[PDB]
Amino acid sequence: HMFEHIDAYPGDPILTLNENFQKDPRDQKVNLSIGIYFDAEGRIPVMGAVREAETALQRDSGPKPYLPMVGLAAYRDAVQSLVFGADHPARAAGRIATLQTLGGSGALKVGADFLKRYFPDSQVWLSDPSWENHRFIFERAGFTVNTYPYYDEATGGLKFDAMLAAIDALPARSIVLLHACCHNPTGVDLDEGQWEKLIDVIEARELLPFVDMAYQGFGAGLDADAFAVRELARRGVPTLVANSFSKNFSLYGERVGGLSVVCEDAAAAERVLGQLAGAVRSNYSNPQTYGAKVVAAVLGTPALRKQWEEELSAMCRRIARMRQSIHDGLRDHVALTRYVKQRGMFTYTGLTESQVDALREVHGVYILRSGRMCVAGLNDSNVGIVADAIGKVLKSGA
Amino acid sequence: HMFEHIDAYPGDPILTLNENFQKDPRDQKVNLSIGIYFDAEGRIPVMGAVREAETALQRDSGPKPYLPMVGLAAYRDAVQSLVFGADHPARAAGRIATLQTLGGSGALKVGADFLKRYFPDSQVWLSDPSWENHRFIFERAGFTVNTYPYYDEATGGLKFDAMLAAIDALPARSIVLLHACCHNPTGVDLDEGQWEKLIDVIEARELLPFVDMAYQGFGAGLDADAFAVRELARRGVPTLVANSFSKNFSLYGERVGGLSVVCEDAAAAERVLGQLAGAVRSNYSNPQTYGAKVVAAVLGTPALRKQWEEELSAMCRRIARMRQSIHDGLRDHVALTRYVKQRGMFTYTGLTESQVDALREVHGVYILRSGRMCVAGLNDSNVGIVADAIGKVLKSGA
Numbered sequence: 001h002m003f004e005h006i007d008a009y010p011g012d013p014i015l016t017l018n019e020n021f022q023k024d025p026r027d028q029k030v031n032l033s034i035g036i037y038f039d040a041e042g043r044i045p046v047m048g049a050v051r052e053a054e055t056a057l058q059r060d061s062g063p064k065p066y067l068p069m070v071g072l073a074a075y076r077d078a079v080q081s082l083v084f085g086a087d088h089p090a091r092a093a094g095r096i097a098t099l100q101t102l103g104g105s106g107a108l109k110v111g112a113d114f115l116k117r118y119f120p121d122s123q124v125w126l127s128d129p130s131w132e133n134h135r136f137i138f139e140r141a142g143f144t145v146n147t148y149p150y151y152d153e154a155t156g157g158l159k160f161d162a163m164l165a166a167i168d169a170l171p172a173r174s175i176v177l178l179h180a181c182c183h184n185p186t187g188v189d190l191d192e193g194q195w196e197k198l199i200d201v202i203e204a205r206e207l208l209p210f211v212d213m214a215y216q217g218f219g220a221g222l223d224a225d226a227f228a229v230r231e232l233a234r235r236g237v238p239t240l241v242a243n244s245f246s247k248n249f250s251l252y253g254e255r256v257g258g259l260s261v262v263c264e265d266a267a268a269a270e271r272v273l274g275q276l277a278g279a280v281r282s283n284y285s286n287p288q289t290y291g292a293k294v295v296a297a298v299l300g301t302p303a304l305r306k307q308w309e310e311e312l313s314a315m316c317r318r319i320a321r322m323r324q325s326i327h328d329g330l331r332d333h334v335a336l337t338r339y340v341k342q343r344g345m346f347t348y349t350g351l352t353e354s355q356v357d358a359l360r361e362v363h364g365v366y367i368l369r370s371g372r373m374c375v376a377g378l379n380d381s382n383v384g385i386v387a388d389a390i391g392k393v394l395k396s397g398a
Numbered sequence: 399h400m401f402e403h404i405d406a407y408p409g410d411p412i413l414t415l416n417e418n419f420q421k422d423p424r425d426q427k428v429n430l431s432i433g434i435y436f437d438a439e440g441r442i443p444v445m446g447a448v449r450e451a452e453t454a455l456q457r458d459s460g461p462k463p464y465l466p467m468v469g470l471a472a473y474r475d476a477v478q479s480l481v482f483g484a485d486h487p488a489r490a491a492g493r494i495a496t497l498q499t500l501g502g503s504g505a506l507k508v509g510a511d512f513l514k515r516y517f518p519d520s521q522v523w524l525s526d527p528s529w530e531n532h533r534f535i536f537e538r539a540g541f542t543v544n545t546y547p548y549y550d551e552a553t554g555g556l557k558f559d560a561m562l563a564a565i566d567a568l569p570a571r572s573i574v575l576l577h578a579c580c581h582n583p584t585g586v587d588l589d590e591g592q593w594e595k596l597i598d599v600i601e602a603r604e605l606l607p608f609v610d611m612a613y614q615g616f617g618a619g620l621d622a623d624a625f626a627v628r629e630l631a632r633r634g635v636p637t638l639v640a641n642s643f644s645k646n647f648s649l650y651g652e653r654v655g656g657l658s659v660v661c662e663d664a665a666a667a668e669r670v671l672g673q674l675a676g677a678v679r680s681n682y683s684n685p686q687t688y689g690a691k692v693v694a695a696v697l698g699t700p701a702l703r704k705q706w707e708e709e710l711s712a713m714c715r716r717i718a719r720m721r722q723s724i725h726d727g728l729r730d731h732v733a734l735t736r737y738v739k740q741r742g743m744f745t746y747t748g749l750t751e752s753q754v755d756a757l758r759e760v761h762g763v764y765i766l767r768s769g770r771m772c773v774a775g776l777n778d779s780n781v782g783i784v785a786d787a788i789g790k791v792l793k794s795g796a
Contacts (some may be wrong), residue, residue: 002606002636003661004572006516010673036463044461049458058456061449063442064651065434066644102500105683113538118404133679140511140680173400208400238400246464253462253687263401274407281531282538283681285503289651290688 014368020368024156029364030386032377035184037247037315037345039377045315047250049308053297067286069277070101071271078299078395079258083216083226083243087168090233094266097273099259099280100287102246104214104244104254105133107259111240112141113279114272119173122208126150126177127163129370131184131212134177143175147388151186158188172206180213180241181225182344185372189343195228203237207239214244217312218319219343245295247345248312254291261367296396319345322378328386334395345376363389402498412766419764427762428784430775433582435616435713435743438777443713445648447706451695463507463686465603465676466538469498473690476697477656481624481641482616488631492664495671497657498685499677501650502612502642505657508607509638510539511677512670516569520606525549525561526577527768529582529610531793532575541573549584554736554748556586560577562596578639579623580742583770587617587741593626600633612642615710616717617741631660643693646710659705717743720776727785732793743774752792 014033019029023105039045070076080098084091101107115122124143126134127150149162167176176197181189192197202209211229219225228366232239238261245256259276263269280286298304327339351359351371359365365386367373378386412431437443466626468474478496482489499505505743513520522541524532525548533543547560565574576596579587588596609627617623630637636659643654657674661667678684696702725737737745749757749769757763763784765771776784 001662002604003516003659003666003670006666006669006673008669044463046459046461054456054459058452061452062443063444064649065442066650089772102682102686105681109681118401133683137680140677206400251462252464253684255682255684255686261401264399268401268404271404271406272401275404278407279538282535283503283507284500284653285531287652288500288653288686288689291686362640 017144024364025331027363028385029366030377030382032373032386033366033368034377035345035374036252037129037250037376038379039315039346040318042377042379042381045250047308047311049304049311050249050251050294052307053294053301053304057293057297064289067100067292068286068288069099069280069286070273071287072289072292072296074300075100075296076258078296079243079374080260082222082299083213083231083241083258083260084233085223085226088230088233090262095263096233096270097261097269097276099273099276100292101242101257101259102255102284102287103246103257104212104242105137105257106255107244108134108137108212108244109141110137110259110276110279110283111242111261112143113282114276115175115208115240116142117279119175119208122173122175124175124177125167125170127179127183128183130177130179130257134212138177146274151188151348152391153350153352156188156335156348157341158194159188160190160194164201167198167207168205169202170205170207173208175208175210176202177210178228179313180211180216180228181219182215183342184214185344185346185368185370186348187342187344187346187375188348190228192227192283199235199237202232208238208240209238210242212242215247216243217248217343218316218345221313221316222309236264238262238264249295249298251291251294254294255288256291256295276342284347319375322375322383323347325383326378326387326390329384330391333388333391345374347373349373349390351393352398358393359389363393365389412435414614415688415764422762424762426783427764428780429764430771431764431766432775433743434650435648435771435774436777437713438716440775440777440779442549443648445706445709447696447702447709448647448649448692450705451692451699451702455691455695462687465498465690466685466711467497467678468671469685469689470687470694473498473694474656474696475484476694477641478658478695480620481611481639481656481658482628482631483621483624485771486628486631488660491542493661493667495659495661495667495674496661497671497674498690499640499655499657500682500685501655502610502640503535503655505651505655506532506535506610507539508657508674508681509640510536510541510678512674513573513606513638514540516673517573517606520571520573522573522575523565523568525577525581527583528575528577532610536575546574549746551748552705554586554733554746555739556588556592558592562599565596566599566603568603568605571606573606573608574600575608575610576626578609578614578626579581579617580613581724581744581768582612582742583744583768584746585627585740585742585744585773588626590625591637597630597633597635600630601633606636606638608638609638610640611740613645614641615646616714616743618710619714620707634662636660636662647696648695649689649692650750652692653686654689654693705732717773719772720781721745722787723781724776724788727782728789728792731786731789743772745771747771747788748796749788749791750796755796756791757787761791763787
């Protein structure tokens with residue numbers, strides 16, 4: 001009876017939901033519950049640049065020794081340059097410790113474990129709402145986790161005054177998890193003016209910003225999407241940055257990401273990098289080779305770098321086209337502003353749980369109970385069907 | 399000054415040692431400090447079966463979605479079959495929870511995090527000595543870590559009576575880390591009789607054995623090397639098993655391994671699997687695809703499975719040949735029994751720290767300060783040079 005007290009892990013309602021979508025016999029059914037990018041044909045793409053890199057890497061069959069704890073040197077440098085910009089002063093001054101991680105998740109974990117060890121009495125604050133695994137990772141890492149106001153139910157927008165006042169009230173060294181852009185699940189983002197005002201507070205109150213940038217390239221392009229990170233670093237604010245290549249390389253299953261920490265000087269950055277390697281040593285020893293070689297080859301080969309940025313920008317524009325298409329489709333029925341104001345792969349539709357049920361059962365369109373829709377699930381084959389469905393449900397009243 | 403209290407991570411003496419080996423101008427220098435398998439030509443091999451699988455996988459360029467938290471289903475089944483044997487009764491009765499992990503390290507981590515959560519007051523016992531990262535992983539996971547007698551300095555063998563008595567004295571649910579075979583760093587292994595006697599105690603005292611099998615295939619073949627795991631499971635003992643594919647697939651840098659937990663019934667195994675997935679969710683969300691596809695393709699394709707087992711057995715025999723060659727070489731000079739009695743990639747030479755210095759400085763042969771030599775670093779080009787060196791150092795006296 002050694003494991004008689006091990007409780008069963010709670011079933012995943014999304015899995016159940018997708019099982020119901022599969023059994024659904026209706027030809028016009030639409031699934032917008034899976035939060036990943038699909039292309040114009042509703043497929044998960046293999047990016048041209050990625051395929052081309054893999055092809056080149058294939059003609060190089062060599063041994064696979066252990067990587068350093070911090071991962072591949074070329075990868076780390078490419079990632080740091082991509083995130084902060086090649087010309088970033090914090091990069092030139094050696095104030096940034098960067099390592100290869102297992103997706104954005106791995107970066108959050110390594111960061112959390114480092115922070116718990118050196119800031120054990122700090123607590124963590126996330127947005128209301130936030131990515132479903134933020135609370136899980138940081139609570140299991142040993143942190144008390146709290147929330148700050150963020151999404152505005154009434155507007156489909158941002159409670160910036162309430163967000164700013166809550167964060168302004170935090171004690172020094174409070175860890176504040178922030179979406180860089182393309183908020184998951186709501187799609188509600190700060191503008192660059194709100195960002196500056198938030199950084200004023202974060203700096204003055206000596207807080208610890210942990211920026212989660214999982215969608216660099218899906219909001220307004222690679223550079224604008226990293227504004228929060230780059231502006232924090234230009235102003236010398238102690239910042240951790242977790243970036244994911246799952247979405248913008250379409251490499252979800254090869255687990256590639258980065259963790260960067262911006263420190264007060266190069267000496268500090270090197271001590272921090274060593275302790276981040278320490279967190280890795282206590283976890284998985286060292287990261288994997290395949291995905292990092294692909295990413296490093298794409299970012300570091302100008303022809304491939306260009307091909308990658310081009311396809312990613314086309315992905316960015318396709319989502320924006322779908323936002324406009326569903327918006328215009330809804331105008332034909334019954335504040336649709338949220339659909340074009342929100343950004344990235346997700347939108348908080350503001351539909352009630354009942355309306356979500358109706359959308360599914362009556363109109364065969366599947367979104368989350370929270371009202372989260374994955375805009376990337378929209379294409380020419382279904383955007384009319386969806387806009388019609390949601391328009392009818394909204395018009396009929398809550 | 400946010401990170402003013404982050405202490406510098408201690409330098410790696412092995413890295414320093416290898417830097418000195420590189421600068422060493424002597425043509426006959428020999429490095430036996432790197433603990434990985436090298437072939438007859440002193441290279442890290444790419445196994446034929448692995449190359450052939452990679453070739454086949456290359457002709458299949460599809461999308462890379464997230465894997466399940468527990469990893470690829472085909473991989474898990476193949477790994478479980480390889481470790482316990484296809485016909486194992488615990489496998490047939492569904493008493494084993496198996497998931498894909500990030501190397502053997504990742505398996506130790508996921509296991510440790512699960513154990514800390516459900517057995518928080520248990521402490522951990524490792525062999526004296528043990529793998530350099532055992533203490534680090536389990537202490538950082540929140541466990542008090544202790545040792546039991548193991549290596550016998552005077553014999554180059556095993557203190558089995560002292561080992562058994564120490565373990566017999568542990569309270570229920572004590573976590574006991576055990577090398578399945580091919581002990582790292584000493585090469586001293588239990589025989590199957592000692593194993594049965596140890597399991598008697600582990601069972602009776604209701605302990606929690608955590609078996610670390612990082613070298614299945616390098617001692618006496620895949621089946622015999624897993625005897626401890628298979629016998630624990632046949633006898634119904636609650637057992638965690640961490641197995642690595644780094645060494646026996648030569649896939650160090652693609653981070654592939656497994657974690658298996660043997661439970662009292664299938665119901666328990668399923669609850670445990672869910673909580674192991676929980677540990678993964680709190681860490682890196684889900685594992686990577688490339689390496690697991692390669693391993694699953696090799697193990698599950700009979701032609702490749704045969705080619706793999708054959709090359710691994712040839713690797714196993716090459717190490718044994720080097721053990722005999724250095725033994726016979728030492729007999730030409732000055733108890734050399736340890737060299738043929740110890741097993742796997744490592745041997746504890748029993749050389750003093752001074753003798754290790756002499757071996758390096760005078761004879762250009764590099765082993766660890768502990769006297770650990772990697773036998774796999776021996777080949778026809780250097781085994782005579784090494785035996786001569788060690789023979790002279792031993793003969794000249796401590």
